Enzyme design. Sequence first.
Site, PDB file in Angstrom:
ATOM      1  N   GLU A 178      -3.856  -1.080   6.287  1.00  0.00           N
ATOM      2  CA  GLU A 178      -2.704  -0.390   6.134  1.00  0.00           C
ATOM      3  C   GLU A 178      -1.871  -0.699   7.554  1.00  0.00           C
ATOM      4  O   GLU A 178      -2.352  -0.156   8.561  1.00  0.00           O
ATOM      5  CB  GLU A 178      -2.562   0.976   5.518  1.00  0.00           C
ATOM      6  CG  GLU A 178      -1.108   1.322   5.327  1.00  0.00           C
ATOM      7  CD  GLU A 178      -0.469   0.239   4.755  1.00  0.00           C
ATOM      8  OE1 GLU A 178       0.268  -0.290   5.567  1.00  0.00           O
ATOM      9  OE2 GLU A 178      -0.417   0.303   3.311  1.00  0.00           O
ATOM     10  N   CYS A 233       4.684  -7.217  -3.420  1.00  0.00           N
ATOM     11  CA  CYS A 233       5.259  -8.054  -4.521  1.00  0.00           C
ATOM     12  C   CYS A 233       6.530  -8.694  -4.218  1.00  0.00           C
ATOM     13  O   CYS A 233       6.922  -9.301  -5.187  1.00  0.00           O
ATOM     14  CB  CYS A 233       5.007  -7.210  -5.793  1.00  0.00           C
ATOM     15  SG  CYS A 233       5.877  -5.564  -5.420  1.00  0.00           S
ATOM     16  N   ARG A 253       6.893   1.304  -3.687  1.00  0.00           N
ATOM     17  CA  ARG A 253       5.774   0.201  -3.728  1.00  0.00           C
ATOM     18  C   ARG A 253       4.434   0.929  -4.018  1.00  0.00           C
ATOM     19  O   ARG A 253       3.420   0.199  -3.925  1.00  0.00           O
ATOM     20  CB  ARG A 253       5.907  -0.432  -2.280  1.00  0.00           C
ATOM     21  CG  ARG A 253       5.828   0.397  -1.191  1.00  0.00           C
ATOM     22  CD  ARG A 253       6.318  -0.316   0.028  1.00  0.00           C
ATOM     23  NE  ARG A 253       5.696   0.211   1.155  1.00  0.00           N
ATOM     24  CZ  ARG A 253       6.050  -0.234   2.567  1.00  0.00           C
ATOM     25  NH1 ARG A 253       6.932  -1.231   2.511  1.00  0.00           N
ATOM     26  NH2 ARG A 253       5.676   0.128   3.605  1.00  0.00           N
ATOM     27  N   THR A 308      -3.190   6.364  -2.279  1.00  0.00           N
ATOM     28  CA  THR A 308      -3.194   6.854  -3.709  1.00  0.00           C
ATOM     29  C   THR A 308      -4.728   6.737  -4.145  1.00  0.00           C
ATOM     30  O   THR A 308      -5.257   7.678  -4.765  1.00  0.00           O
ATOM     31  CB  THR A 308      -2.404   5.920  -4.734  1.00  0.00           C
ATOM     32  OG1 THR A 308      -1.186   5.456  -4.041  1.00  0.00           O
ATOM     33  CG2 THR A 308      -2.130   6.588  -5.827  1.00  0.00           C
TER      34      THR A 308
HETATM   35  N1  LIG Z   1      -0.396  -7.515   6.652  1.00  0.00           N
HETATM   36  C1  LIG Z   1      -1.048  -6.606   5.961  1.00  0.00           C
HETATM   37  N2  LIG Z   1      -2.326  -5.999   6.337  1.00  0.00           N
HETATM   38  C2  LIG Z   1      -2.603  -4.686   5.852  1.00  0.00           C
HETATM   39  N3  LIG Z   1      -1.758  -4.204   4.947  1.00  0.00           N
HETATM   40  C3  LIG Z   1      -0.381  -4.739   4.578  1.00  0.00           C
HETATM   41  C4  LIG Z   1      -0.159  -5.657   5.119  1.00  0.00           C
HETATM   42  N4  LIG Z   1       1.076  -6.241   4.749  1.00  0.00           N
HETATM   43  C5  LIG Z   1       1.623  -5.035   3.972  1.00  0.00           C
HETATM   44  N5  LIG Z   1       0.319  -4.225   3.913  1.00  0.00           N
HETATM   45  C6  LIG Z   1       0.696  -2.865   3.273  1.00  0.00           C
HETATM   46  O1  LIG Z   1       0.168  -3.042   1.693  1.00  0.00           O
HETATM   47  C7  LIG Z   1       1.166  -2.308   0.961  1.00  0.00           C
HETATM   48  C8  LIG Z   1       1.253  -3.165  -0.446  1.00  0.00           C
HETATM   49  S1  LIG Z   1       2.279  -2.326  -1.673  1.00  0.00           S
HETATM   50  C9  LIG Z   1       0.927  -1.251  -2.478  1.00  0.00           C
HETATM   51  C10 LIG Z   1       0.742   0.096  -1.970  1.00  0.00           C
HETATM   52  C11 LIG Z   1      -0.265   0.802  -2.564  1.00  0.00           C
HETATM   53  N6  LIG Z   1      -0.748   0.132  -3.608  1.00  0.00           N
HETATM   54  C12 LIG Z   1       0.195   2.350  -2.895  1.00  0.00           C
HETATM   55  O2  LIG Z   1      -0.167   2.873  -4.077  1.00  0.00           O
HETATM   56  O3  LIG Z   1       0.747   3.076  -1.982  1.00  0.00           O
HETATM   57  C13 LIG Z   1       2.147  -1.818   1.588  1.00  0.00           C
HETATM   58  O4  LIG Z   1       2.246  -0.391   1.666  1.00  0.00           O
HETATM   59  C14 LIG Z   1       2.073  -2.498   2.881  1.00  0.00           C
HETATM   60  O5  LIG Z   1       2.545  -1.630   4.024  1.00  0.00           O
END
Ligand SMILES: Nc1ncnc2c1ncn2[C@@H]1O[C@H](CSCC[C@H](N)C(=O)O)[C@@H](O)[C@H]1O
Lengths: 272, 273, 200, 198
Positions: free
Chosen positions: B38, B84, B252, B19
Amino acid sequence: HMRRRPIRVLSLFDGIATGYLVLKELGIKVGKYVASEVCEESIAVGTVKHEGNIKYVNDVRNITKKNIEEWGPFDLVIGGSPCNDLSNVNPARKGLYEGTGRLFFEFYHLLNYSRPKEGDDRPFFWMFENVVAMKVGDKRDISRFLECNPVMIDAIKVSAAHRARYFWGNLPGMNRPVIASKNDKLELQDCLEYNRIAKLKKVRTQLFPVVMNGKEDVLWCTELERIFGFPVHYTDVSNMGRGARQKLLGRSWSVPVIRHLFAPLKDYFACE
Amino acid sequence: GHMRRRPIRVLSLFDGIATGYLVLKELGIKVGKYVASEVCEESIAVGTVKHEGNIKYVNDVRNITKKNIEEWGPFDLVIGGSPCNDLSNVNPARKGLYEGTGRLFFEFYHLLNYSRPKEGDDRPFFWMFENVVAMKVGDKRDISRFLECNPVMIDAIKVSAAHRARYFWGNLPGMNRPVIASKNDKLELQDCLEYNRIAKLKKVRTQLFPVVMNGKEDVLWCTELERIFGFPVHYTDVSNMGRGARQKLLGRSWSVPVIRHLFAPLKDYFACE
Amino acid sequence: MFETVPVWRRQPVRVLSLFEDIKKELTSLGFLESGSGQLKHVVDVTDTVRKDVEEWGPFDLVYGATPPLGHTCDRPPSWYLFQFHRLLQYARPKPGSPRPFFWMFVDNLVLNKEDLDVASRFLEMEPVTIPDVHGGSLQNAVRVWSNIPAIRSRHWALVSEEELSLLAQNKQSSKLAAKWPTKLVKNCFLPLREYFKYFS
Amino acid sequence: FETVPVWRRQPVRVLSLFEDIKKELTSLGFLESGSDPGQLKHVVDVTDTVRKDVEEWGPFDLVYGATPPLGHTCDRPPSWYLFQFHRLLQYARPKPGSPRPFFWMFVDNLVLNKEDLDVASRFLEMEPVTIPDVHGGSLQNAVRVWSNIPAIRSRHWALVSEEELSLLAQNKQSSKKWPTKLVKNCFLPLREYFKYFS
Ligand SMILES: Nc1ncnc2c1ncn2[C@@H]1O[C@H](CSCC[C@H](N)C(=O)O)[C@@H](O)[C@H]1O
Ligand SMILES: Nc1ncnc2c1ncn2[C@@H]1O[C@H](CSCC[C@H](N)C(=O)O)[C@@H](O)[C@H]1O
């Protein structure tokens, strides 16, 4: 001499509304487009991608002689009945007289209802489509009921797929040679998304036609759509998954082929 | 004289469906470098395809070293929205800011300090961290204690057709300025639905069938969900993904118009087209 | 890294002691003076902000530790480490005026394998295992992250993670009072005698 | 339609498809024996019969078609008979400019299966008439008839079930000529419109 009027279409086995898409992108005004179709996912693509300008009437075997008078007159009657009972790809196919093959006679039946009666010289156009890989006796029998011989148009000349089909009908210039356009995507690599590489230059009907990051992969819906000349995301409708969309596109007409066949109809009907 | 404006160099942690890169390119800002951490390969598919390889993906946030930040940097903007599911009241089995996926916040806080300029360096450096309002008070407090600032709350309801109340810590120019909607924002849910579908309610929340069509209820369509979050239509029609995958990534994500509001002042600090 | 300057110029060490108090062990070694104070001890750093640490300071030594093994913690063990890392940054010398500055975080087998990886990335070193061995068996053990010069020489490679994990599995179930084995860490400060006053 | 007096009634011109009904029809006087060899055209394999073939042979006043007998080992799909009959029936219809008495009949000896029955009645714009051969209170044979000949519906037997026909279609063909007795007498109402021979 009669002034140009919008075209009135009856589409049996309409699928995802290819006949309407080609007619609109050709700039022909469509006064009426009665589509007969039973697949709910199919109906949904046509309903929203064309904003309810299509009148859906469901099963072709419930269309009555008086339905054809009320809904008509029709200037154009088109149809491409289901094929997997006439294809030599299918080992368990039941032929032209059993299974879904006998749906041809419904198109033949409704055509005659649609046809103008004696004393009516108004233009009347029709086209029926089916697979090249039939039993020769089925090809003969279809030619005998429609009273004309087919033309063979292969989408390979205009798209990136092997899609050989017969077209019966009376459309102006069906026999004229098929000429590809600048905007046609002739090779598969013209249909692929970013960072994807085409194994071959034309796809047939290899089960993994693309390699991405040095590893095999299947085609994507957006990529299939371009192979059949449909707009991208044409089938991103009503939360359909991968399996649904590729079924609709597998049953489809290759739109550049239809653009080729319908193109002369611009000289006979009102156009924007 | 003063500083020339140069392309912005982003480090986006937890990037999701890219995004931040979308908003930046849509604002006309030039993007010199966009490093995304990601893990979800469907999300990476979207960012890869939709943005044609401009994004540099670096896998798990917890494998990013101090040397990694100095090689890949310098960075002008560090952004992140941690997961979250462990910080929100929606989950009764939540484990909070210090266990689960909640503690991924400290990984943002950790890399932020690595990217921050040294004391002698007066160069522009901006950052922003996002999370959900429905958060234990003491978790809100601790994030603010670690990030050394308090958050501004921006509900996507002002600019979109959804209830999406979120907290934004950061130093972005003009975060506190009032959120004003744009001509082309789709405020009511009816503005987001496809042909022949009527919106029960004017805003979505976070019935279970919010739309009726031909007199019978229906769930939302991905093309409509994408309009609700402010994404371009078919932005998640990528790599044969189905209904469930797309609304997972969209569920998300940040609200595009909200990120636009937060990032628009950056046009004055970085080179644009 | 830093130079040694003579005893006549060595000043009292200024100590920030978080969560656990190592006031007695530091007096016992002559870094503090009997009966005063150069040590700020804080048990809760929840509302401690940067200017709190700036006001109480400056500091030459920041020390932190987990609750003793067996003592049910008031919070998740990682809290002691994130909060330690937070305040550590507040107390660091600004790069404009570098000076001898030391820190140390100690775990009495409270942090689990996940926490430990977190600790080692944030503190930029793998931990040092200092055990209490008696009669050839493992009595107690702490893990040390620190930038004091000699610390990586107190490590015992002979102590396996299974041996540490089993020592923790029993010392937890024992119903005895939990005692913080500071004896294990007190000897780690002796390389700091060259930088700060010794009190007799 | 004007009804002629008897004296210059004309001889029925007949087109008979698949089965031949020449001699069933001379039995009723519609064709005079030894008479011209054109009053009745008969074709069995209409595979390559085209529109102009039927136009040449004709015109016809009656177009008859029938499936093979029940016990007969049929080679073609049962619907082929109905589709081919419908196809040629159109070729032989009078133009709307030149209207004239025109009759047709299609007969099934329980060869068409159930799914074929609705398409039959859809194509022939009519529900079939069941003419059974009943003996001793038991169903021996039956035909289904579609036709516009005036009296056809009054030879129906509503007493004969659809399952009663299906089970007779199972059992009798397992063991196992054309039951033309059932169909012969339906043509009688045509006697008024064309010459009778003695
Ligand atoms: N350990 C990790 N290291 C890197 N990214 C991670 C992670 N654990 C989860 N994530 C990623 O972080 C995101 C958190 S929710 C936020 C998504 C983002 N703000 C948007 O607009 O699309 C998720 O898409 C998830 O895949
Ligand atoms: N009984 C019936 N009545 C109406 N449509 C039918 C039908 N049985 C099958 N069909 C439809 O006929 C189609 C034949 S495939 C032809 C698709 C169409 N020509 C296109 O361009 O998309 C299938 O999509 C199938 O859904």
